[PDB]
């Protein structure tokens, strides 16, 4: 039955490709060519958070658009007051090989994980004052690459063991496990409604997951290399997935296909981070070429370069109110651009 | 600036704590353990005492070594190998009792991040290597080995084959042979790490 099953799978893939082609009637550039360009977006560094001592691998924004958590390779996850560049917390990590961090939407918990296979949840609102490791979510066999908070209890994590796992920080167990990626899952993004989320795996694909039922809905492909970052459109109806192919791409949830590729011939270095703007008109993508390029999300043209980092930028993210862009890099500096 | 002064005080205090912790952590020597599965990484890391990264630490002749055994990471190496860009060396282990490790050594010696780090090559299972030589020709592993089937020549040929993978001018591969029962591995690591420390500090000053 192996031959019949393989033939059925090939026929299903062909049918999916045919449906995706049939749903394709026009391109994004064909429609958004008539709109006026955004001009030259000359963002300038307003703040430079000179706290960390090693490579910065992740950084996340609080829901208040002011506080930011930054996890570095020096075994520290400092929490940043962006307006004053003040440090509010400095959480020493048991394992210094961390490559992700999250800031809870309520602002109570901070997650952090990495090569130790365990996602660690920290309680910032402890009565004793000090930040305590409220939980250490174990169960992954590979490095934890991403982790996002749905609420103070739930949390979804993406690991290098080709599986995504939804946890419950109270019981400390995998409520749902997501399987289907054929390679390391190096990125994750949760929808604004926190009911859906998409992960970008190293097998040059991005899958759509439902947090509740735990069944994959749609598989998005088109990249030629490992995807290192993923981010939803602010409407939650689309997402962008920058990869190591030196090209970012825009995918549509409803159209089930890519809409625009943000590739420039001068760029050869892979993307480490992708993040839209509050209006979704800009796609600030961080490149391993030591520079970050602001992309016109509708016309696929560059509108400015956030150069100023002496090493590869590893993380990027706009505030909730869109008032700023924060970029981390391996030079140990986090810069606030506005 | 009402109680933001106390916030600034707290930020300065924890910045000082960060600086002190970084200074304390910079003293330790970071090393990376690599090799094939069951190649002897566990044996060497356990004979010196003390499924994720199995970090190991010890003190030897006033140096604090930190051996980051990453054998439990059964995934793509390239997606996390750049994290160890700051390691002093890459302690590499090969079980001479058993070809598979040569490709991994070639990949890790020509990696774009490890063009400067010096790979230390350990060859364990010397007695088992001799036993296999007596039982079977050493040409089984390498059919192109046009030489006698003796330990003194087969081991040298394997060492030369491993070292041939080097292509950088400013990196050196150190080699040693062990019988899986020698306590001199710590001294060998100490000598190699002292040499690598001198070379790296000279490169940083521009004198190298």
């Amino acid at each position, epitope marked *: 039955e192996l031959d019949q099953l393989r033939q059925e799978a090939e026929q299903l893939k062909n049918q999916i490709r045919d449906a995706r082609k049939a749903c394709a009637d026009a391109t994004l550039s064909q429609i958004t060519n008539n709109i006026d360009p955004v001009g030259r977006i000359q963002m300038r560094t307003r703040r430079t958070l000179r706290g960390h001592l090693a490579k910065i691998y992740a950084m996340h924004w609080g829901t208040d658009s*002011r*506080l930011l958590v930054s996890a570095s390779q020096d075994g520290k996850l400092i929490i940043w*007051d962006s307006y*004053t560049t*003040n440090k*509010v*917390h400095a959480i020493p990590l048991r394992s210094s090989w961390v490559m992700t961090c999250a800031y809870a939407p309520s*602002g109570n918990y901070v997650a952090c994980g990495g090569l130790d296979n365990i996602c660690s949840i920290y309680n910032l*609102k402890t*009565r*004793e*004052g*000090n930040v305590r490791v409220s939980r250490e979510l174990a169960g992954h066999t590979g490095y934890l690459s991403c982790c996002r908070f749905l609420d103070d209890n739930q949390i979804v994590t993406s690991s290098g063991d080709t599986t995504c796992a939804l946890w419950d920080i109270e019981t400390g167990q995998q409520t749902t496990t997501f399987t289907g990626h054929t390679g390391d899952v190096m990125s994750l993004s949760l929808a604004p409604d926190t009911r859906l989320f998409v992960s970008g795996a190293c097998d040059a694909s991005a899958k759509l997951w439902d947090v509740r039922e735990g069944m994959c809905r749609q598989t998005f492909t088109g990249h030629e290399s490992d995807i290192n970052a993923i981010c939803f459109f602010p409407n939650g109806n689309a997402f962008a997935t920058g990869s190591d192919d030196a090209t970012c791409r825009l995918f549509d949830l409803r159209a089930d296909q890519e809409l625009m590729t943000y590739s420039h011939d001068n760029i050869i270095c892979g993307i480490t981070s992708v993040s839209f703007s509050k209006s979704g008109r800009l796609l600030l993508a961080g490149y391993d070429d030591f520079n970050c390029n602001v992309w016109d999300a509708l016309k696929a043209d560059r509108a400015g370069v956030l150069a100023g980092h002496d090493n590869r930028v590893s993380c990027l993210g706009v505030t909730d109110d869109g008032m700023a862009v924060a970029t981390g890099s391996w030079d140990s500096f986090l810069k606030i651009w506005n | *600036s*009402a*109680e*933001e*002064r*106390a*916030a600034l*005080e*707290r*930020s300065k*205090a924890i910045e000082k704590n960060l600086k002190e912790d970084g200074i304390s952590a910079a003293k330790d020597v970071k090393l990376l353990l690599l090799g094939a599965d069951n190649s002897g990484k566990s044996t060497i890391v356990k004979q010196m005492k003390i499924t994720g990264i199995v970090e190991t630490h010890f003190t030897f002749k006033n140096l604090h070594f930190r051996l980051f055994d990453v054998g439990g990471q059964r995934s793509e190496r390239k997606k996390w190998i750049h994290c160890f860009e700051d390691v002093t060396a890459i302690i590499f282990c090969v079980d001479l009792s058993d070809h598979e490790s040569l490709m991994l050594f070639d990949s890790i010696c020509n990696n774009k991040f490890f063009i400067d780090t010096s790979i230390i090559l350990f060859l364990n299972k010397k007695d088992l290597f001799g036993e296999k030589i007596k039982k079977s020709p050493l040409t089984i592993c390498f059919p192109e080995y046009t030489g006698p089937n003796t330990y003194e020549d087969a081991a040298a040929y394997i060492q030369a084959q491993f070292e041939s993978k080097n292509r950088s001018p400013n990196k050196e591969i150190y080699c040693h042979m062990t019988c899986a029962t020698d306590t001199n591995n710590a001294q060998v690591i100490f000598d190699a790490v002292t040499d690598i420390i001198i070379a790296n500090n000279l490169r940083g000053c521009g004198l190298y």
Partner: single-chain antibody
Amino acid sequence: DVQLVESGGGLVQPGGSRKLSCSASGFAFSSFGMHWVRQAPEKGLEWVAYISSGSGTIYYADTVKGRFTISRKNTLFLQMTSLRSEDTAMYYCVRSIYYYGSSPFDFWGQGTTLTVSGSDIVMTQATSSVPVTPGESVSISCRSSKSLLHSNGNTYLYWFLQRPGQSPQLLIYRMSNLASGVPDRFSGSGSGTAFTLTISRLEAEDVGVYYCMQHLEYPLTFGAGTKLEL
């Protein structure tokens, strides 16, 4: 759990001295700034001193400066010299750590009883006492000598509830935020100079004396307080 138990009670002849101690446990004392607040046998609260984390900054009251010295094993010492007649008061031990979103003055010690044989932002509560029945709405007014809305956007009015015979509990910090453990029945509002603490669905435990405290600039001047008697 968290605790600030303190000792040093007794009777001192005028001109004496004492080294008051505050035994702290259940929290990272070295990472908190410890205050000292006192109550006269009949009057309201009054700030005494303040020591910060790391002992970087130390402040004292106008009538306390020089005479009383603060210092810190998880134990805080208020080295106290030249006791006078006016120094007789129930000294309290209060912790406070300041950062963006923090809750200063949150926990208060059980207090210790001691007996002896120009730019102040004075806060005034016109209503000395308000007779209010359970289950009804109550309101306690507060004033200031200057606007408490700093340029950073935060008003620094703090509200404390002192049950009869118990330590004060931080009810509202920065005039709008509700401290942890405080029920939703308590609310506060104000703008610049006039502040109002709103209490809905009054209960038996809410009976006590309510204090309005400013934090825009040291000294932390305290209001006269409203005795919301049952």
